[PDB]
Design a protein around this nucleic acid. Structure first.
Ligand SMILES: [Ca+2]
Ligand SMILES: [Ca+2]
Ligand SMILES: [Ca+2]
Lengths: 333, 336
DNA sequence: AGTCCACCGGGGGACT
DNA sequence: AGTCCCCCGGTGGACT
């Protein structure tokens, strides 16, 4: 659970344990001795808790400590079982904390989307926890999916085939050079009509059990191929902490997205943002005031709309609701 | 020395030691116990050796092992002075291995420039180690300076004042809409030597090795040229990355695009050449990534790539020979 | 198996 | 001293 429990740890099958011993079954060209089972860690710490949608304590807790908890719980476990020998590289923690930050924040935006869709479709405005009821006029057409995009993804595959296609007429008359596309961590797309009546988009999850991990993370498949170009509503990049070299992959990808979607496909301004918990060198805010490169060719707006620093789980959800309430005003009911 | 020597180690002052014990002098907020004194490590390991201009053995050694040498020598020192007590973090070794790849590679390119500028000037093509003589037509106006750019630099400061104003008026324009176009830095720039300096000799002298004094000469060199380069005269930008990961390719890609927009797009310069070097690409992804077309002039202009090449130097000789080749080609549309 | 992907935190030094 | 900069290697998991 969120608070460590000697009882629940002793009760885990060895395969569900948060630390895995691999000393006597090692990985080629790796001296890793103990592995951080991040999926188990999600299962154990957020198995029943989705920050911002649980207890008042959790929701308004410092989000840093919320995202820190699994690795803390894992470290406690490891010391219980392997008192002298428990050792994990700082880079094991860095990798896991980054993914847990992406996954949990994507899980908070799932439950928002769900609550929001429920309102849009003519069910209530759910109130546990209480959150400002949106003032937008409901319509099943204003629903949204929140897609935690996977590693190795290409975002152009979200687009409907007509549009993958106009991004190749242009791409074709352009090749030893090309123009590849990568991925935001997360995209918020307008729900496609086909799916506007399906129930899975209105159901909040109770926790990041393995099957709920799978539900959220496979969700992009369902939408591959069915999203129009002005219907990609937000892109997010999660970086837990910042360093000045680690800023540029979102800034590049926002520019490319903007060049293709706005210039070669006619979408409105592509809203792209970055979430961090530790911006240190506030260079970062000034760096993300960068003009969109493509737009300085035409006749202008930002490439990255905002560096956002969430204080609490619940703040994440206020902002995203406020977003939807504003942004889906565009879309017709 | 390049290979570890207990006597060279014993003669070091304590301030020159490759490992510094800070166990009773902790850094605020930091649990570091021993620091990798990287300037010291460059002096110890490379103080008398600039790869590619040294023994045929070193010059043809795998460049990975050449660049890994300072950390190794430092770990040996550590093991000597501190035995089982000696611990350094992986991240310390990574930080310093990276800087060492930028610093040493730039010294290889510094010596290449010295040799090249001698030829260009009416002096010779110095013969050891044998490198194929360039065929370009010699001229003093074809000399180049190799600038190791520092942390936190803004390459725009290299340019002549008249070109910085063109760039300032533009961003004045952006500012009035709550936008900027920040510029940062590649790791290294090869600039055409300005005329004021085409008769100065420091640019024609090869260094013996990376003693502190030469470390300073090379890393200070950019101050001598600030405010004096014309847009057309930035002639090669290089980003060094000892090893790649997919997320770590985008700083040079992004800054190449901002360099291009501004040099090409706002100051009529030619295609700005910008390459990335690496000893460890972990596959083929990074090569396809670096075929991205430069973005501003995708939006009445010849299209070209943002980053001209991802180069993977196998040996230091190869780095020297590739840069000599480059200059031979590239330095033509400067009139002699 | 191997091979790819992209996570980020502990750093040495410049500058103040 | 205190603050900032830009360095990269060891990772857990998806895929085959
Ligand atoms: Ca990310
Ligand atoms: Ca470590
Ligand atoms: Ca670099």
């Amino acid at each position: 659970p969120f608070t460590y429990s000697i009882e629940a740890t002793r009760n885990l099958a060895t395969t569900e344990r948060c630390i895995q011993d691999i000393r006597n079954a090692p990985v080629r060209n790796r001296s890793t001795q103990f592995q951080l089972a991040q999926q188990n860690m999600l299962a154990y710490t957020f198995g029943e808790v989705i920050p911002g949608f649980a207890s008042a304590g959790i929701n308004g807790m410092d989000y840093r400590d919320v995202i820190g908890r699994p690795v803390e719980n894992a470290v406690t476990e490891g010391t219980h079982f392997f008192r002298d020998d428990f050792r994990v590289d700082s880079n094991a923690k860095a990798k896991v904390a980054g993914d847990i930050f992406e996954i949990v924040s994507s899980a908070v935006m799932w439950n928002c989307a769900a609550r929001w869709n429920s309102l849009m479709v003519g069910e209530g405005w759910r109130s546990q926890p209480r959150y400002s009821r949106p003032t937008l006029s409901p319509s099943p057409r204003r629903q949204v999916a929140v897609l935690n995009l996977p590693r190795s993804f290409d975002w152009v595959s979200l687009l409907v085939p007509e549009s993958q296609e106009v991004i190749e007429e242009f791409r074709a008359g352009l090749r030893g050079l090309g123009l590849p596309t990568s991925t935001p961590d997360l995209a918020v797309v307008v729900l496609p009509e086909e799916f506007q009546n399906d129930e899975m988009w209105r159901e909040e999850i109770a926790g990041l059990t393995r099957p709920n991990q799978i539900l959220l993370s496979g969700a992009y498949q369902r939408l591959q191929g069915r999203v129009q170009p002005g219907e990609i509503s937000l892109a997010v990049a999660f970086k837990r902490s910042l360093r000045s070299d680690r800023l540029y992959q979102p800034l590049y990808e926002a520019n490319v997205m903007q060049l293709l979607l706005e210039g070669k496909l006619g979408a409105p301004k592509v809203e792209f943002e970055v979430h961090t918990l530790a911006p240190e060198g506030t260079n970062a805010f000034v760096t993300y005031e960068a003009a969109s490169l493509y737009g300085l060719a035409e006749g202008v707006h930002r490439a990255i709309r905002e560096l956002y620093v969430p204080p609490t789980a619940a703040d994440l959800a206020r902002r995203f609701f406020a977003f939807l309430n504003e942004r889906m005003e565009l879309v017709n009911g």
